[PDB]
Amino acid sequence: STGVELYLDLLKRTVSNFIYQDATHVAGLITQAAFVEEARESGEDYPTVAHTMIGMKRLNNLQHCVESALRDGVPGDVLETGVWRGGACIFARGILKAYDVRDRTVWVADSFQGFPKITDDDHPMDAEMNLHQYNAAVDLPTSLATVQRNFSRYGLLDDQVRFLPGWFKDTMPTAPFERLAVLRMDGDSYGATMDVLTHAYPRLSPGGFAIIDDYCIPACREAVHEYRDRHGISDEIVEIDRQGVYWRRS
Amino acid sequence: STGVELYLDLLKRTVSNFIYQDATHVAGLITQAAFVEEARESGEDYPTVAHTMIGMKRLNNLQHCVESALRDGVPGDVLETGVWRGGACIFARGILKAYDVRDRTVWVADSFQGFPKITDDDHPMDAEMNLHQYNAAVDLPTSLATVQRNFSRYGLLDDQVRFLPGWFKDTMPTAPFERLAVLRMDGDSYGATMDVLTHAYPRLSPGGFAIIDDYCIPACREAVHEYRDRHGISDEIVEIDRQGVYWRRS
Ligand SMILES: CC[C@H]1OC(=O)/C=C/[C@H](C)[C@@H](O[C@@H]2O[C@H](C)C[C@H](N(C)C)[C@H]2O)[C@@H](C)C[C@@H](C)C(=O)/C=C/C=C/[C@@H]1CO[C@@H]1O[C@H](C)[C@@H](O)[C@@H](O)[C@H]1O
Ligand SMILES: CC[C@H]1OC(=O)/C=C/[C@H](C)[C@@H](O[C@@H]2O[C@H](C)C[C@H](N(C)C)[C@H]2O)[C@@H](C)C[C@@H](C)C(=O)/C=C/C=C/[C@@H]1CO[C@@H]1O[C@H](C)[C@@H](O)[C@@H](O)[C@H]1O
Ligand SMILES: Nc1ncnc2c1ncn2[C@@H]1O[C@H](CSCC[C@H](N)C(=O)O)[C@@H](O)[C@H]1O
Ligand SMILES: Nc1ncnc2c1ncn2[C@@H]1O[C@H](CSCC[C@H](N)C(=O)O)[C@@H](O)[C@H]1O
Ligand SMILES: [Mg+2]
Ligand SMILES: [Mg+2]
């Protein structure tokens, strides 16, 4: 109903392409290419064209996290670790824009090359899963230049969008943000989750939100529990849909 | 900037599909399928997937006309005659939604079958052009149910959108609107333009806008001048882009 609500509603439907309803890649448990409403609603398919694969329920979750941070005066930026085509970060920048927020940044972190090749240093669950095998099949490698172009299409490429290109184990320890209000983790593997919890989570403000996109994946979940056990973190884990969870840092 | 401005901006870029940049059908003077930014900007291509073909300059014109009418208190509804997939009507409905206007309607008038088969009742310029020949090539015939579906994808199918299915010569004389603030004519032919000027233009409020999408088409232009000459209409014809013009009713 308000201009703000209308904009953010359309922005979600647009970055997930409920508007034009692109086919999905046939991969994983998806056995047909046709668009299925319930799969895009829950972020369960692999869009051929859409700018995000997280789906409406996880987009609604990101909106709730950012809005709650803003309402409650939780200081800091938004970081997403694993962005693909950039749709969820585009949406994040859009939320700031809708509220005319000029003092927070959206940090966009990725290899911009898809999943890394497995080495002997990987966690054995990451090695067995070998996410790198799927890069082309779902068009995962998405260059920095492409992501930036995608932001421009929505008129949201500006100096409150900053990019952190590279492997998370390399980029996160010295990433130049001071404080985060929302940390959205979407790198799927034990390694990526643990890199980001280790190196970015300490900068998450009290009251801020930690979102684990891929908690359904056993390697991801293992890292979340190892990390929480190590640091004494007991904040409730709340489910979003069939894949994602989040907690709010107390 | 404001929520409203951001919504209407995004809605334009969405119905014209500047977001995902679909190919064009190859037809008329368009010889290549690739998306070309300047052609989508000026509404000169035949989108394979986008909901309107009128392009950003003619979307912007529609916005200007509807907002001036609202601002100046010109009474009445919005009618578009020739709606194809419905994008320009979806956009009009979205303008009213953005300003929380609850007392005006968007009327959506089309054969829902593309251009009419030519008979010996048609104006000789319409018969020579034979627009009907291009129906399949630019995917023109678009059913009422498809247009309703498209509105629903934006959240804009409600009781302030009303449909007028049929040939304009049949639907216009008794169409149930009482007054119009904007009359957008997009039927291309002498016949479709003369049908709508004859039977709907008298209901256009003073201060209201008459938009001729296809003024570059000689048959359309002939109808426009015959009608203005007959009724003594001398209101300045203002050019929008390389196709459309409008005037404001004195
Ligand atoms: C297509 C790429 C995809 O791969 C699949 O979905 C693979 C599904 C396998 C076929 C499953 O195996 C089956 O289930 C049982 C084991 C009995 C089955 N049985 C026949 C033995 C066995 O066949 C998995 C359950 C295996 C486990 C290890 C797992 O969870 C692996 C996850 C893989 C995730 C990537 C999607 O990338 C990310 O997904 C995130 C969730 C998204 O948010 C998003 O970030 C996205 O980019
Ligand atoms: C594909 C559909 C299209 O067809 C064409 O573009 C055909 C172009 C012909 C090929 C041109 O002729 C050629 O020029 C040279 C002299 C070399 C050729 N030579 C063989 C002599 C000669 O043949 C035209 C100039 C002929 C004249 C009669 C004309 O204007 C016809 C109009 C046709 C309009 C429809 C566009 O649909 C509507 O357009 C609106 C503008 C939009 O707003 C929108 O509503 C849309 O739905
Ligand atoms: N260790 C690592 N370092 C940096 N990027 C990683 C990584 N492991 C996976 N990625 C990136 O993680 C992303 C997973 S898919 C992320 C989906 C995205 N959030 C969306 O809205 O659709 C891919 O873009 C991939 O390149
Ligand atoms: N005499 C007539 N009666 C009713 N509909 C007509 C007609 N002549 C043409 N049409 C319709 O006119 C439309 C021309 S294309 C309209 C483009 C649309 N305004 C957009 O935003 O993209 C087609 O949908 C066609 O079916
Ligand atoms: Mg994920
Ligand atoms: Mg036209």
DSSP string of chain B, one letter each residue? --HHHHHHHHHHHHHTTTTT-PPBPPBTTB---S--HHHHHHT-S-BSS-S-SSHHHHHHHHHHHHHHHHHHT--SEEEEE--TTSHHHHHHHHHHHHTT--S--EEEEE-SS-SPPP-TTS-HHHHHH-GGGGTTTTT----HHHHHHHHHHTT--STTEEEEES-HHHHSTT-S---EEEEEE---SHHHHHHHHHHHGGGEEEEEEEEETTTTSHHHHHHHHHHHHHHT--PPPEE-SSS-EEEE--
User: Are A153 and B18 inside 8 Å of each other by CB?
Assistant: yes
What spacing in Å lies between the alpha carbon of A240 and ligand 5's midpoint? 13
CA distance B155 to B191: 34
Amino acid at B2: T
Select from A7, A20, A51 the Cβ nearest to the Cβ of B6.
A7
Torsion of Cα atoms, A16 then B138 then A32 then A91, to 10°: -10
CA distance B91 to B96: 9
The protein residue whose alpha carbon is closest to atom 34 in ligand 1 is A131
- Ligand-binding annotation for B18, yes or no, is no
> Is the CB of B10 inside 8 Å of chain A's CB atoms?
yes
**A95-105 exposure pattern, b = at least 16 Cβ within 10 A, e = fewer:** bbbbbeeeebb
CA distance B138 to B134: 6
Select from B2, B14, B49 the Cβ nearest to the Cβ of A3.
B2
User: Which one, of A104, A112, A78, A72, lies nearest residue A200 by Cα?
Assistant: A78
> Is the CB of A13 inside 8 Å of chain B's CB atoms?
yes
| Residues listed for chain A | 250
- Ligand-binding annotation for B91, yes or no, is no
User: Are A10 and B13 inside 8 Å of each other by CB?
Assistant: no
CA distance B8 to A249: 36
A192 lines ligand 3 (CB under 6 A): yes
User: Is B201 in contact with B208 (CB distance < 8 Å)?
Assistant: no
Tokens 């090539």 map to which residue?
B137
User: Is A111 in contact with A166 (CB distance < 8 Å)?
Assistant: yes
CA distance B233 to B64: 22
CA distance B48 to B189: 23
B134 lines ligand 2 (CB under 6 A): yes
What are the residue ranges spanned by the domains of chain B?
1-250
Residue A104 makes CB contacts below 8 A (sequence gap 6+) with: A76, A77, A78, A96, A160, A181
CA distance B96 to A62: 28
Q: Which atom of ligand 4 is nearest to the CA of B114?
A: 26
Q: Which two tokens stand for residue A166?
A: 């590279």
What spacing in Å lies between the alpha carbon of A140 and ligand 3's midpoint? 8
Q: What distances in angstroms separate CA A80 from CA A158, A162, A223, A249, one per listed residue? A: 17, 11, 17, 17
> Is the CB of A189 inside 8 Å of chain B's CB atoms?
no
A168 lines ligand 3 (CB under 6 A): yes
Q: What distances in angstroms separate CA B80 from CA B59, B90, B196, one per listed residue? A: 13, 11, 10
- Helix, strand, coil % in chain A, rounded to nearest 5: 40, 15, 45
Alpha helices in chain A (DSSP H): 3-15, 37-42, 55-72, 87-98, 124-129, 144-153, 168-171, 190-200, 218-231
CA distance B232 to B250: 12
A142 lines ligand 1 (CB under 6 A): no
B3 contacts on A by Cβ (under 8 Å): 2-7, 98
Q: Rounded to the nearest 5°, which phi and psi values hold at A12? A: -60, -50
Q: Resolution of the coordinates in A?
A: 1.8
In a mutational test of the B interface, the residue from A6, A8, A56 whose CB has the highest number of chain B CBs within 10 Å is A6
Write the residues followed by a gap in chain B (C–N more than 2.5 A). Answer: none
A22 contacts on B by Cβ (under 8 Å): 20
Please, which residues bridge with residue A210 across strands? A183, A247
What spacing in Å lies between the alpha carbon of B127 and ligand 2's midpoint? 13
Q: What is the largest CA-CA distance in chain A?
A: 54
Please, which residues bridge with residue B109 across strands? B81, B164
Q: Which two tokens stand for residue B122?
A: 């048609």
User: Is B123 in contact with B96 (CB distance < 8 Å)?
Assistant: no
Tell me how crowded residue B60 is: count the other CB atoms within 10 A of its CB.
Answer: 15
The protein residue whose alpha carbon is closest to atom 11 in ligand 4 is B82
Q: Which two tokens stand for residue A94?
A: 């859009």
Residue B38 makes CB contacts below 8 A (sequence gap 6+) with: none
| Structure determination technique employed | X-ray
Mutate to test the pocket of ligand 4, among B44, B93, B111 (most ligand atoms within 8 A of CB): B111
Tell me how crowded residue A48 is: count the other CB atoms within 10 A of its CB.
Answer: 14
Q: Which two tokens stand for residue A119?
A: 């080495």
User: Is A107 in contact with A212 (CB distance < 8 Å)?
Assistant: no
Give the containing element (helix H, strand E) for A184. strand A180-185
Q: Which two tokens stand for residue B155?
A: 């959240």
Amino acid at A196: V
> Is the CB of A11 inside 8 Å of chain B's CB atoms?
yes
Residue A125 makes CB contacts below 8 A (sequence gap 6+) with: A190, A218, A219, A222
User: Is A89 in contact with A83 (CB distance < 8 Å)?
Assistant: yes
CA distance A59 to A43: 9
Rg of chain B (C-alpha set)? 17
Residue A154 makes CB contacts below 8 A (sequence gap 6+) with: A11, A14, A90, A94, B10, B13, B19
CA distance B188 to B1: 36
User: Is A135 in contact with A141 (CB distance < 8 Å)?
Assistant: yes
